Amino acid sequence: KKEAEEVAAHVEQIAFIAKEQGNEEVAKLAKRLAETIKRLNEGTEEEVKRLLEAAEVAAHVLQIAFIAHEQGNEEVAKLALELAESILRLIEGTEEEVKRLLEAAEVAAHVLQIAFIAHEQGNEEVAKLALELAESILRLIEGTEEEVKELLERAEEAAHVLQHAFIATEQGNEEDAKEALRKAEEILRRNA
Amino acid sequence: AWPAWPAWPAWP
């Protein structure tokens, strides 16, 4: 139960920094997340820890939204705000679907960070693919398909291929990066 | 397993 205290302290520090910078959306979301961590301090131990991991993911998403808003592009910022809202909405206790949607949400947060880093480095094709994939994962998590498990597995595979392309671009190997981008685009487009 | 994700940003 001591991890919850650390997570709440970090979330409140994020809220303080957001209030200092003037990001009211991130401040409101951090306050909501702190209240959610408060109201979930006691309960079943097997689920409290998973909800704390979800709260850690949400705090990282808030950090990503904050740095995206501070350092320019608002696409990543708005997508991360929506992702944090989705995480806070699903935390409210639909376990059989939340245990599956939380992995997809964390993958979406990773893809958002990928898009932000790639845009800050001029690799705008990876950033476009990452934004498209993050939109796909967000619409799948918020959607009521209930066939979402297979589509989310497909999207996570595409996200890992995109991560491979990102690492290739960071290392300087464009020949494999373009092929990985093509493969990820094919995997994502196979969802229609 | 999969290649590791980029690390989370620095805590504000």
In chain A, where the domains are located: 1-77, 94-192
Tell me which method was used to determine the 3D structure: X-ray
Q: Using only the alpha carbons of chain B, give its radius of gyration.
A: 10
Closest CA to B5 of A62, A57, A110, A129: A110
Cα gap A162→A177, rounded to integer Å: 9
Rounded to a whole number of angstroms, the distance between the first and last alpha carbons of chain B is 30
Q: What token pair was written down for A122? A: 């001029």
Locate all alpha helices (DSSP H) within A121-147, ordered by sequence.
Answer: 124-142
Structure tokens at A151: 């589509």
Among A69, A71, A79, A88, smallest CA distance to A128 is for: A79
The CA-atom distances, in angstroms, between B9 and each of A11, A57, A150 are 13, 11, 30
* CB contacts, 8 Å: A113 with chain B: 6, 8-9
**Do A146 and A98 meet the contact criterion of CB atoms below 8 Å apart?**
no
Q: Which two tokens stand for residue A147?
A: 């066939």
The widest CA-to-CA distance across chain B, in whole angstroms, is: 30
Q: Which tokens sit at A80?
A: 């991360």
Distinct helix (H) and strand (E) counts, chain A? 8, 0
Does A114 contact B at CB distance below 8 Å?
Answer: yes
| Closest-CA distance of chain A to residue B8, Å | 7
**Residue in B with minimal Cα distance to A14:** B12
Whether residue A166 contacts residue A178, with contact meaning beta carbons closer than 8 Å, is answered with no
For A13, the closest of B6, B9, B12 (CB atoms) is: B12
